[PDB]
């Protein structure tokens, strides 16, 4: 149950930044966000991993914080990962 409090809620400004940091992820690395999303959001498992629609409104804070922290491993630890 601590998982619900351990995860901090992602605000609008943040979900925006998130959608922008996800947009920074290269095709191979962004298949992970689709995967994190599809897996953590089994309600969108009908969606294909190469055709995913990251719905930041349906994405749980957990997924969003994961997506965000995930991209940061590729973005805030490496400049332009598609270069």
């Amino acid at each position: 149950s601590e998982e619900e409090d351990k995860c901090k809620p992602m605000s609008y400004e943040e979900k925006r930044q998130l959608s922008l940091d996800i947009n920074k992820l290269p095709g191979e690395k962004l298949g992970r966000v689709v995967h994190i999303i599809q897996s953590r959001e089994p309600s969108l498992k009908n969606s294909n991993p190469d055709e995913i629609e990251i719905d930041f409104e349906t994405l749980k804070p957990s997924t969003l914080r994961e997506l965000e922290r995930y991209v940061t491993s590729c973005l805030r630890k490496k400049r332009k990962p598609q270069a």
Binding site: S19, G27, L30, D50, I52, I54, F56, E57, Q82
Partner: peptide
């Protein structure tokens, strides 16, 4: 509302 991210292959910028 944050716009739904359309990930239709090759969306990296």
């Amino acid at each position: 509302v944050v716009p739904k991210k359309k990930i239709k292959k090759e969306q990296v910028e």
